């Protein structure tokens, strides 16, 4: 309705699911699956019961290497997990048939918790998830074992760590994909402060699903930040569709055509040809043996170029099966395409700039780290408005084992719990389905 654009949507095998879907059916503001994903990420907590038990038995609470001799408590938490989880659930829920979920995993070593959505509807933010979950499990453990008044503070420290002396839950044995509100680089950034490795872990390293989840989170943040309001809204929606949703099978087809022998440069050549074939760009001027291209639709050129960028990452880092060169792809795809065409690169230079710093901060002494530790809230990688981090998630999904700070190292607790959730694990499926459902309401 606001925009006339339509897109064809596909599954992660490259098969058509629904043709001619209005662009706004994919908007975070309209699509009910994106709403369910975002509310799900606000409300879901991983609880490490085994970790709580071990911290208590050794008195190792409050952060790395910390221990309080004489405070040890030996409680059979994992052996009584069913009871503890049920008692916690009774405190966590609002009513008995609401959407609270408390599910044991790993023979009671872990629990998936989804705090009821209704607590968030009367909350300013999202910290009720860890805070309600933490106190419910602290109280349920105390009540299970009749832990005394004198000892119960150790249970609290084992669950939530050094908070509130520390600002973070330092040493906690619960985890969420979000991080505390004080760590936001700016207001509106919370859906950006989600480690790439956590996205890759939740999607079980399926490259397209990782790219989709990351794009959904990034572009949803762009709405919360106001970046996708007014003049920019269509640019952001088309980015979501083409870079993260595989609209028109463009990413998929570019990878298919370049996967056997291709390079970043061969993907660029194919994308420019496709943009020309589709009327997105046209020759504006002839210089000496050089065509200067123009466009009457910068948002659409940006989106095609963004799909090419994702494909280039998949081809380049997929061929190496090593994620580190994503920083280089993000840079030189954009640098090469501008000199190839005379048109601006993705995000009007902001991907390329993000890539310059990200390259530096993943190959230098000064900060950063490997690709998986970045996120849209990281100072190095915040600058592009959603068009860079999803490529990093695709690259880390394709990494075969070259990283020390891999998702296995950083994100195991998150993987066990959050990959249980179908809409987190396979978002592309659910978002496409919801878009097809609401296609006639736009």
């Amino acid at each position: 309705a606001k925009f006339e654009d339509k897109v064809d949507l596909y599954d992660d095998r490259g098969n058509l699911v629904e043709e001619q879907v209005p662009l706004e059916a994919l908007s975070p503001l309209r699509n009910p699956a994106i709403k369910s994903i975002v509310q799900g990420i606000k409300r879901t907590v991983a609880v490490n019961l085994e970790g709580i038990e071990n911290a208590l038995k050794t008195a190792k609470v409050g952060g790395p290497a910390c221990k309080i001799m004489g405070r040890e408590l030996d409680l059979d938490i994992v052996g009584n997990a069913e009871s503890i989880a049920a008692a916690a659930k009774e405190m966590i829920q609002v009513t008995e048939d609401d959407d609270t979920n408390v599910e044991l995993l790993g023979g009671g070593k872990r629990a998936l918790v989804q705090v009821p959505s209704a607590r968030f509807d009367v909350a300013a933010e999202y910290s009720a998830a860890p805070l309600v979950t933490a106190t419910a499990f602290v109280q349920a453990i105390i009540n299970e074992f009749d832990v005394s008044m004198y000892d119960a503070n150790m249970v609290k420290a084992a669950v939530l760590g050094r908070y509130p002396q520390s600002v973070e839950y330092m040493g906690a044995n619960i985890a969420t994909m979000l991080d505390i509100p004080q760590k936001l680089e700016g207001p509106g950034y919370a859906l950006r402060n989600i480690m790439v490795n956590h996205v890759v872990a939740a999607t079980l390293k399926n490259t397209l699903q990782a790219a989709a989840l990351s794009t959904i989170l990034e572009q949803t943040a762009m709405f919360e930040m106001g970046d996708a309001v007014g003049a920019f809204e269509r640019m952001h929606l088309l980015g979501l569709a083409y870079q993260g949703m595989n609209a028109d099978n463009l990413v998929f087809d570019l990878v298919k055509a370049n996967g056997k022998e291709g390079t970043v440069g061969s993907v660029i050549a194919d994308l420019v040809e496709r943009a020309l074939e589709d009327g997105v760009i046209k020759v504006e001027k002839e210089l000496t043996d050089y065509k200067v291209y123009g466009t009457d639709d910068l948002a659409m050129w940006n989106a095609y170029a963004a799909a090419g960028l994702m494909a280039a990452t998949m081809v380049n880092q997929g061929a190496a099966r090593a994620a580190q060169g994503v920083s280089s792809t993000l840079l030189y795809y954009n640098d090469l395409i501008e000199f190839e065409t005379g048109l601006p690169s993705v995000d009007f230079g902001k991907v390329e700039g993000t890539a310059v710093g990200f390259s530096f901060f993943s190959h230098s002494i000064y900060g950063g780290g490997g690709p998986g530790i970045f996120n849209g809230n990281h100072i190095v990688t915040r600058h592009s408005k959603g068009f860079a981090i999803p490529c990093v998630a695709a690259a880390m999904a394709l990494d075969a084992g070259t990283q020390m700070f891999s998702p296995e190292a950083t994100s195991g607790l998150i993987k066990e719990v959050f990959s249980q959730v179908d809409e987190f694990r396979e978002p592309l499926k659910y978002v496409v389905e919801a878009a097809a459902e609401i296609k006639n309401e736009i």
Binding site: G70, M149, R162, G370, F405
Partner: protein, 548 residues
């Protein structure tokens, strides 16, 4: 025997300490004091030099209508006017803080794993020793790879270096001892065994950046500066490309994944980065103080050395400057480390507990809290009632509240072996004191005090925490003098009675067991006395680069 404070009271006043009356107004105001006289003279010289009035004894009210007292630094025979204990006037106090602020602990465990896996290279005691030669050139601010680098003057940065420690005696013994904090040499045998078992085969760096840099910059500089020069030294000593993808793993490990900050960052109202005083938990401060490894046969001495460390840092520098400023809070803190007063009260409590229960043998419960904290509170308060000179010495109610309750809380923890019931005894002391004398501290003293009992054993989000994990940022404690250093003492007390090698973090305990520090953390009170006498030599000065 005489109470432990009698010598000091006899030095302060002409009357015996029991005498009830005196005469005032005869001493000539400020003119009675060597120090105030020095200040008046300096103020005249400063104001003339710069053309703006400055210190003037005739502004506001006339100091010294009573005796301006000397203070005995407890455990010493040094007596000084209190102005020599102000942190601004005491280079030992400033250096104590610089030595903490400029330290970080940085693992080599992830780093050695990156070397073996991503680079496919060996790590051995020999490659470590070469790395340590390299980093000890680089850390103070000198180059190892690029041409045309310009460097820090080695003499300006002579206090900066890197050592290591490990629980693996085989490696510890093989490195040049110049670079090793040797757990076997620094700690008595039982403590050493505990500490080595905590560390295991881990290898950890203790990095100290230059005092001149820490003073120019802030605490949040320390882990960055450390990581830059660890990074350069890894490149040089292990033959990486000088800036390849693996370089970033060393950076992330040294800055985030295997760093221990002394303090964590603070909320916005009191915005500060890492390695500032408010971020240092009470258990860390107890572990920084090194009294535990020297004075272990005397748990009172260990606990009160921690109180001195914390009262000075937390009340004088932190609350009295970072969080306020001006004249500040010298005597709110000196009450806890002068005139052997806290020592008298705490030795009484220790004796009470040792005779009635035996150390660490009392039930860990409210009955023990009620017994011990009440008995010690009434002893302390009785001393102020029996010795008018003592009451005129610790003239502010807050000072008395802190001292009496520190003795009561430490003694309760000596009985239970548990800091949490120690903390409950601290709050009970305050409530009893308030009722006994119909006063407690300053207008705001007992905010935490009145929240106190209910929050000792709470488990709620921003309320529940074992005392060792609390610190200056625990909400109720974030504002007020006369508590934080005493809480560090209570955190130390049960561990000192138990004979534990550390209170909360063994790495922090080992990291200050080092005579290459500028300040001597084994004898905090002795150091404060040396600074008061103008005899302590700090790092960080600019004399080498300024005119004669």
């Amino acid at each position: 025997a005489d109470k432990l404070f009698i010598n000091a009271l006899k030095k302060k006043f002409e009357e015996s300490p029991e005498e009830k009356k005196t005469t005032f107004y005869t001493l000539g105001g400020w003119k009675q004091s060597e120090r105030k006289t020095e200040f008046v003279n300096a103020g005249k010289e400063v104001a003339a030099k710069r053309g703006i009035p400055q210190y003037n004894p005739d502004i506001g009210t006339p100091l010294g209508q009573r005796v301006l007292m000397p203070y005995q630094v407890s455990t010493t025979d040094t007596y000084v006017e209190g102005d020599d204990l102000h942190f601004v006037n005491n280079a030992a106090m400033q250096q104590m803080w610089d030595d903490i602020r400029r330290t970080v602990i940085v693992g080599l465990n992830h780093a050695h794993a990156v070397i073996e896996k991503r680079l496919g290279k060996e790590v051995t005691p020999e490659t470590i020793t070469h790395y340590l030669e390299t980093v000890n050139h680089a850390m103070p601010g000198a180059a190892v790879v690029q041409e045309h680098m310009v460097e820090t003057h080695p003499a300006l940065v002579a206090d900066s270096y890197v050592k290591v420690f490990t629980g693996n005696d085989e490696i510890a013994d093989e490195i040049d001892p110049a670079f090793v904090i040797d757990i076997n040499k620094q700690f008595p045998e039982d403590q050493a065994e505990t500490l080595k078992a905590e560390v295991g085969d881990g290898i950890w760096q203790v990095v100290r950046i230059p005092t001149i840099v820490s003073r120019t910059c802030d605490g949040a500089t320390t882990s960055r500066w450390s990581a830059m020069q660890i990074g350069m030294s890894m490149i040089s000593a292990y033959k990486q490309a000088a800036g390849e993808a693996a370089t970033g793993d060393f950076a992330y490990a040294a800055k985030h994944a295997e760093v221990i900050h002394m303090g964590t960052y603070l909320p916005v109202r009191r915005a500060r980065g890492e390695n500032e005083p408010g971020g240092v938990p009470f258990g860390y401060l107890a572990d920084i103080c090194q009294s535990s490894r020297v004075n272990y046969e005397d748990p009172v001495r260990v606990s009160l050395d921690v109180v001195a460390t914390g009262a000075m840092l937390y009340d004088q520098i932190w609350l009295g400057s970072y969080m306020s400023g001006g004249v500040g809070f010298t005597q709110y803190a000196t009450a806890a480390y002068t005139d052997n007063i806290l020592d008298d009260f705490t030795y009484f409590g220790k004796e009470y507990v040792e005779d009635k229960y035996g150390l660490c043998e009392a039930p860990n419960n409210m009955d023990t809290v009620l017994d011990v904290a009440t008995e010690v509170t009434f002893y302390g308060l009785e001393q102020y009632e029996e010795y008018p000179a003592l009451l005129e010495d610790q003239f502010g109610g807050s000072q008395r509240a802190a001292v009496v309750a520190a003795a009561a809380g430490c003694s309760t923890a000596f009985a239970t072996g548990n800091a949490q019931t120690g903390l409950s005894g601290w709050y009970l002391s305050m409530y009893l004191h308030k009722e006994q004398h119909s006063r407690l501290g300053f207008y705001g003293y007992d905010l935490q005090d009145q929240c106190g009992a209910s929050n000792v054993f709470s488990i709620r989000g921003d309320e529940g925490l074992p005392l060792e994990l609390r610190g200056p940022n625990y909400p109720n404690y974030a504002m007020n003098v006369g508590h934080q250093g005493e809480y560090a003492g209570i955190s130390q007390a049960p561990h000192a009675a138990r004979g534990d090698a550390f209170v909360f973090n063994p790495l922090v305990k080992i990291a200050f067991a080092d005579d290459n520090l500028v300040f001597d953390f084994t004898n905090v009170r002795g150091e404060f006395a040396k600074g008061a006498l103008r005899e302590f030599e700090p790092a960080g000065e600019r004399a080498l680069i300024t005119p004669a």
